[PDB]
Amino acid sequence: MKVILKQDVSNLGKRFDVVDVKDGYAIHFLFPKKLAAPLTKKSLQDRDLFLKKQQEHYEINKALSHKLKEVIEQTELHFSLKEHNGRPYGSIITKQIINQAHTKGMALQKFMFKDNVRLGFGDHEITLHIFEDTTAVLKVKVTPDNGVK
Amino acid sequence: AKKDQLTLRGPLYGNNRSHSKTITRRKWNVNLQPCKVKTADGKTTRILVSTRTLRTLKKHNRLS
RNA sequence: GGGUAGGUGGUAAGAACCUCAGAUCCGGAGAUUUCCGAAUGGAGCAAUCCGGUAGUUGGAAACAGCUAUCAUUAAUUGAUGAAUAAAUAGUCAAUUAAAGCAAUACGUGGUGAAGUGAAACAUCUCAGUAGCCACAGGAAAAGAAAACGAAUGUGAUUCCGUGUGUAGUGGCGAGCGAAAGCGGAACAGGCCAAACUUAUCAUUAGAUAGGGGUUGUAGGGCUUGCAAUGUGGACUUGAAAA
RNA sequence: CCUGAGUAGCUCGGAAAACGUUAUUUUGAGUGAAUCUGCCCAGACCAUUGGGUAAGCCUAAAUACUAAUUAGUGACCGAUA
RNA sequence: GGAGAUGGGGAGCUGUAGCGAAAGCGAGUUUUAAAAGAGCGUUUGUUUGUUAUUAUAGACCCGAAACGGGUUGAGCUAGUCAUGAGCAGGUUGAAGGUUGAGUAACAUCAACUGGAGGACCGAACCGACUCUCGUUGAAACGAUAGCGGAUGACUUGUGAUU
RNA sequence: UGGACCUAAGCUGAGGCUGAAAAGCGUAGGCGAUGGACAACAGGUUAAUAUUCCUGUACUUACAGUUAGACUGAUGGAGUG
RNA sequence: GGACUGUUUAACUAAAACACAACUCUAUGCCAAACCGUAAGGUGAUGUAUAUGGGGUGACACCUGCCCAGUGCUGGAAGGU
RNA sequence: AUCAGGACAUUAUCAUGUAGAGAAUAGGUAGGAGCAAUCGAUGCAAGUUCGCUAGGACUUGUUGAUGCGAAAGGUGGAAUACUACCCUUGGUUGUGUGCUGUUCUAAUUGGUAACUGUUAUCCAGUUUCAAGACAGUGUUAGGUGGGCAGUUUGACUGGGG
RNA sequence: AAGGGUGCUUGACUGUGAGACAUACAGGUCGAACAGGUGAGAAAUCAGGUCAUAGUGAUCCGGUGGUCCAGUAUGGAAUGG
Ligand SMILES: [Mg+2]
Ligand SMILES: [Mg+2]
Ligand SMILES: [Mg+2]
Ligand SMILES: [Mg+2]
Ligand SMILES: [Mg+2]
Ligand SMILES: [Mg+2]
Ligand SMILES: [Mg+2]
Ligand SMILES: [Mg+2]
Ligand SMILES: [Mg+2]
Ligand SMILES: [Mg+2]
Ligand SMILES: [Mg+2]
Ligand SMILES: [Mg+2]
Ligand SMILES: [Mg+2]
Ligand SMILES: [Mg+2]
Ligand SMILES: [Mg+2]
Ligand SMILES: [Mg+2]
Ligand SMILES: [Mg+2]
Ligand SMILES: [Mg+2]
Ligand SMILES: [Mg+2]
Ligand SMILES: [Mg+2]
Ligand SMILES: [Mg+2]
Ligand SMILES: [Mg+2]
Ligand SMILES: [Mg+2]
Ligand SMILES: [Mg+2]
Ligand SMILES: [Mg+2]
Ligand SMILES: [Mg+2]
Ligand SMILES: [Mg+2]
Ligand SMILES: [Mg+2]
Ligand SMILES: [Mg+2]
Ligand SMILES: [Mg+2]
Ligand SMILES: [Mg+2]
Ligand SMILES: [Mg+2]
Ligand SMILES: [Mg+2]
Ligand SMILES: [Mg+2]
Ligand SMILES: [Mg+2]
Ligand SMILES: [Mg+2]
Ligand SMILES: [Mg+2]
Ligand SMILES: [Mg+2]
Ligand SMILES: [Mg+2]
Ligand SMILES: [Mg+2]
Ligand SMILES: [Mg+2]
Ligand SMILES: [Mg+2]
Ligand SMILES: [Mg+2]
Ligand SMILES: [Mg+2]
Ligand SMILES: [Mg+2]
Numbered sequence A: 001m002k003v004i005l006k007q008d009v010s011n012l013g014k015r016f017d018v019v020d021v022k023d024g025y026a027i028h029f030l031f032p033k034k035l036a037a038p039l040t041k042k043s044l045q046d047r048d049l050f051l052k053k054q055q056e057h058y059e060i061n062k063a064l065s066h067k068l069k070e071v072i073e074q075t076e077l078h079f080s081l082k083e084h085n086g087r088p089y090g091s092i093i094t095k096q097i098i099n100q101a102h103t104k105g106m107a108l109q110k111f112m113f114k115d116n117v118r119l120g121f122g123d124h125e126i127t128l129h130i131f132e133d134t135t136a137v138l139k140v141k142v143t144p145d146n147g148v149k
Numbered sequence B: 001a002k003k004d005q006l007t008l009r010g011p012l013y014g015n016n017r018s019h020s021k022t023i024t025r026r027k028w029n030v031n032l033q034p035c036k037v038k039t040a041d042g043k044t045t046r047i048l049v050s051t052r053t054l055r056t057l058k059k060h061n062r063l064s
Numbered sequence C: 001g002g003g004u005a006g007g008u009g010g011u012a013a014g015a016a017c018c019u020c021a022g023a024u025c026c027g028g029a030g031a032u033u034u035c036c037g038a039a040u041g042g043a044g045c046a047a048u049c050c051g052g053u054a055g056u057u058g059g060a061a062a063c064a065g066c067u068a069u070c071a072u073u074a075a076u077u078g079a080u081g082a083a084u085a086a087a088u089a090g091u092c093a094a095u096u097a098a099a100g101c102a103a104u105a106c107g108u109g110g111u112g113a114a115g116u117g118a119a120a121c122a123u124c125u126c127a128g129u130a131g132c133c134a135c136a137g138g139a140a141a142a143g144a145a146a147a148c149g150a151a152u153g154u155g156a157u158u159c160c161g162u163g164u165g166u167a168g169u170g171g172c173g174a175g176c177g178a179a180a181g182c183g184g185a186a187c188a189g190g191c192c193a194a195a196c197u198u199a200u201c202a203u204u205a206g207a208u209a210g211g212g213g214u215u216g217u218a219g220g221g222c223u224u225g226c227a228a229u230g231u232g233g234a235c236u237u238g239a240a241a242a
Numbered sequence D: 001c002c003u004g005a006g007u008a009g010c011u012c013g014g015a016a017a018a019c020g021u022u023a024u025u026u027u028g029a030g031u032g033a034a035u036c037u038g039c040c041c042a043g044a045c046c047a048u049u050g051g052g053u054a055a056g057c058c059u060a061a062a063u064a065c066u067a068a069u070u071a072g073u074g075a076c077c078g079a080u081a
Numbered sequence E: 001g002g003a004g005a006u007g008g009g010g011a012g013c014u015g016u017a018g019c020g021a022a023a024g025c026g027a028g029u030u031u032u033a034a035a036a037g038a039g040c041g042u043u044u045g046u047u048u049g050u051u052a053u054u055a056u057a058g059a060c061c062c063g064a065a066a067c068g069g070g071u072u073g074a075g076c077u078a079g080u081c082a083u084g085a086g087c088a089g090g091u092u093g094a095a096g097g098u099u100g101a102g103u104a105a106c107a108u109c110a111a112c113u114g115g116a117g118g119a120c121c122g123a124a125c126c127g128a129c130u131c132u133c134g135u136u137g138a139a140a141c142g143a144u145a146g147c148g149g150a151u152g153a154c155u156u157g158u159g160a161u162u
Numbered sequence F: 001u002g003g004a005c006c007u008a009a010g011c012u013g014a015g016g017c018u019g020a021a022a023a024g025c026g027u028a029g030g031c032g033a034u035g036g037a038c039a040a041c042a043g044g045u046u047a048a049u050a051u052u053c054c055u056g057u058a059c060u061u062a063c064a065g066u067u068a069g070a071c072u073g074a075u076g077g078a079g080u081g
Numbered sequence G: 001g002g003a004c005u006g007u008u009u010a011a012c013u014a015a016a017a018c019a020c021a022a023c024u025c026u027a028u029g030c031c032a033a034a035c036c037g038u039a040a041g042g043u044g045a046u047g048u049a050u051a052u053g054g055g056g057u058g059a060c061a062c063c064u065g066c067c068c069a070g071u072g073c074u075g076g077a078a079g080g081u
Numbered sequence H: 001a002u003c004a005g006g007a008c009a010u011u012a013u014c015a016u017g018u019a020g021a022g023a024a025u026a027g028g029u030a031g032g033a034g035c036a037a038u039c040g041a042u043g044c045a046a047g048u049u050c051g052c053u054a055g056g057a058c059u060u061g062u063u064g065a066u067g068c069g070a071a072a073g074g075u076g077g078a079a080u081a082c083u084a085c086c087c088u089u090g091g092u093u094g095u096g097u098g099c100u101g102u103u104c105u106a107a108u109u110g111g112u113a114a115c116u117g118u119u120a121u122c123c124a125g126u127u128u129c130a131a132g133a134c135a136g137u138g139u140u141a142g143g144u145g146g147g148c149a150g151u152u153u154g155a156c157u158g159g160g161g
Numbered sequence I: 001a002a003g004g005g006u007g008c009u010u011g012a013c014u015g016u017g018a019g020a021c022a023u024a025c026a027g028g029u030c031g032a033a034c035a036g037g038u039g040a041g042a043a044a045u046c047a048g049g050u051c052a053u054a055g056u057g058a059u060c061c062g063g064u065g066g067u068c069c070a071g072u073a074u075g076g077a078a079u080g081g
Helices: A025-030 A044-074 B051-059
Strands: A002-004 A018-020 A129-131 A140-142 B012-015 B025-029 B032-037 B046-051
Touching: A002 A044, A002 B046, A044 A140, B032 B051
Parallel strands: none
Antiparallel strands: A002 A018, A129 A140, B012 B025, B032 B046
């Protein structure tokens, strides 16, 4: 069914476009990831009339996303020291959402679908790398330090 | 019960006709499947609805 | 209030009283109404046991009297509040309703057999009957044509007679059996959504509260005029009368 | 400009109507329309003619019954009834 | 209208024209090329009362073994679970252990200790193999005399449960 | 001897799960002895009651006042039971 | 005849019948197979192939022969329906 | 969701075929008497495919304006260049369908573990692990199915069988 | 002769059918005669299967051919007769 999409996707479209994609990828992947949007103003001619505002809406959500990037790039010392044996046993057991217990609410939201971190989420006792993608062009680099309490 | 939670549409009782027209009572059950419906960005309850109601929600932009 | 000269319920005599400041008796309106029972403070082997809370009176206190309250669910409101910042889940409090029963009877809906008949039996019949369950009401259900149906036709629903045991439907067997039309009982038609417009919600409203509208020989909205201040309701409070 | 969409239709299994499933009505699974030059119906179906406006709601009366209250009746019974 | 006879109510029903599957024709019609032939017709009504028979209802009365639907029963009994209790008395004397002999060291043998067994005899207790009696009994299953088990796969009380 | 104390099998069971309906299962709680904990013995008396009434001698648990000493220590942990 | 001790048709059959320790085959890798229900739930089992369920035989000793045509079970390339 | 594979149709593109005779590898039906040259020949070098060991065709590089007996000779049932339609077979960028084969997670599942509601083995929420478009469930359609149910299983007969 | 041979042919016809046999019914058997158009024969006459009696199965259901009937508002079609 017809869906207009917001961000950049490897297939289908670039920014605004109308793609006929199956509902499985739309209601379960494209919609929760903010990579697409349902029928704009509920029809096609309605979409055409409202596209003259959707462009600026895309501009301003990108603008606030850039503001969100600045907010992480400002205060960023969000730290965490683990309680382990330390010398022979070193591994971060915080998963991801313990770190999201220090981003969303306390500081810049940094939603779970926004941070494109790997599946190991850091397993070291030293400064590491956090990658977050507000958009398809912005790359976020965070350096958290670790250790023993 | 094996029924929808949005609507109240339930099973349909009927006959199981075969060759020689032998009568045996049977029950048609609704295609109950689990779905999660957001409501004002919160309370994403995992309700058990039929596929027909699921299609209605999908065409209504998940409105219920 | 009526109405009197007797009354104190029956097996029922006697003893002792009441009653003419109007008794007993009959009618209307009230008062009290132990315990169990939907039973609902908790339990339980029904008519029992064990309590909490807030008052008040005795005691020097434990305690004991005398009161009121204390179930669950649903809806509304307010407070508090997890995993986890916010927010929900949850918790608490207040208010309002629900519980159950019976009329061996009628209504609606869900589920739903078998004996039997077909001279056996499986389709079929029995029968959508019995039974089981849910919800009522004083009736319920139905109801204002996306209709009948073959015409210069009728014009919500319901019930009665006929149409007829007809057209039809049936291992075309046992059987089942209307819908039109006609004659009667009664008769009533109303109201929302959308357009359009008003006000307000970080007005992303796609939401809330109003005006406008309710259709078929199409209706309504948009713009522009004439005529209207009535008739009638399935309608609220009162007053009066029969 | 508005006139009720997972709706009417269609397919696969059932059923309601007198009908043993079929034009009409309904639905468990799937699919799925149009917008007064529109849609549905007149026993498969098509064309002409005609009829009616589905997918929203409420509706007294005539109708069904008597556990009970008052009055009364019976070619009903009269202690095995 | 008296829980009336009845009056209104002609909706309808039977007869008046039949024949044919039917359109259709008509004292004719169907069959057929036929008019011939043959089949059916070319007339005798209706509404009630009474009696007889018959159809639907349980249909003259009494009688099944049954079938389906609902409830009540594990206080008897069968199993399982929880918690208790009981088995008078007397015998046999395992494994094992100690000591001594013995063995190169084992094995083996002797004495003592030890008290096991779905062990033995036999009461309460449990069960019911036999004769007799009873068979409208004392008793809807027992009595006398014998009989099997009797520390166990035992017996039993209370409570729960299928 | 049993409640005002406690639990076994099992029953009930707010929420909750499952199921056309009735209902079934089940968590927290609550019941449930045939078990556990808890202080009284001897004699006499009436026609009928007696560790219950009477005589004699005891014990237990609460509350208040008082004297002396001591810091008191559970809805939870551990031991015993 | 049954290895044995035992169990059985309350109220005509206590036995050679059933059971029993033992043998063998088969299924089951754990949310296990099997089983009660419609499902939830539960037994198996708070167990893990030295374990569980089912079929057959029935101490101990010696043995258990031939047939895979038919039926049952397991596996199988392609090919035909 | 993505990747790879072969299959059937074709948008665009090439070719592909030997009875003899016929200067020769003749798939059929037409117009058909001229045709080629910077949409560049003779000679040469290489290559995929094909094979009748001879040949067809496509592609690249030099070459340079002269040629076609494969128009006109001639043979043959079918005859030659050029422009079209119709058959066997192969490759190609490309879409349309499913078929087995992988990977991924967000649907969904868990009788993995943890936290919270919560003094709580259930349940709910949030994770984590393990699976994963499988599984489970609904509808439809085959196979097996005395586990279960409703019934049938005749009459004559020197009684019945 | 109703047996054998030869020639020509297809009456092994169409619509019927007064009257009888035998029969519970359903069915069966014989048949004069009429109309149409034929075959044999000069004609009269004969031919509606064989010298005669066995050689056969109701209804329902569906299929095939023809058809001067119906065609659910009308024209067809479907579906029937
Ligand atoms: Mg039946
Ligand atoms: Mg008075
Ligand atoms: Mg029957
Ligand atoms: Mg019968
Ligand atoms: Mg009979
Ligand atoms: Mg009503
Ligand atoms: Mg229709
Ligand atoms: Mg029916
Ligand atoms: Mg119209
Ligand atoms: Mg019609
Ligand atoms: Mg409409
Ligand atoms: Mg009496
Ligand atoms: Mg008497
Ligand atoms: Mg009259
Ligand atoms: Mg005549
Ligand atoms: Mg007369
Ligand atoms: Mg017992
Ligand atoms: Mg013994
Ligand atoms: Mg207790
Ligand atoms: Mg006790
Ligand atoms: Mg005494
Ligand atoms: Mg024995
Ligand atoms: Mg014995
Ligand atoms: Mg016996
Ligand atoms: Mg005996
Ligand atoms: Mg299960
Ligand atoms: Mg377990
Ligand atoms: Mg044996
Ligand atoms: Mg043997
Ligand atoms: Mg053998
Ligand atoms: Mg073999
Ligand atoms: Mg096989
Ligand atoms: Mg579980
Ligand atoms: Mg699936
Ligand atoms: Mg099947
Ligand atoms: Mg069978
Ligand atoms: Mg059977
Ligand atoms: Mg029967
Ligand atoms: Mg016989
Ligand atoms: Mg005989
Ligand atoms: Mg004889
Ligand atoms: Mg001859
Ligand atoms: Mg002859
Ligand atoms: Mg038939
Ligand atoms: Mg017609």
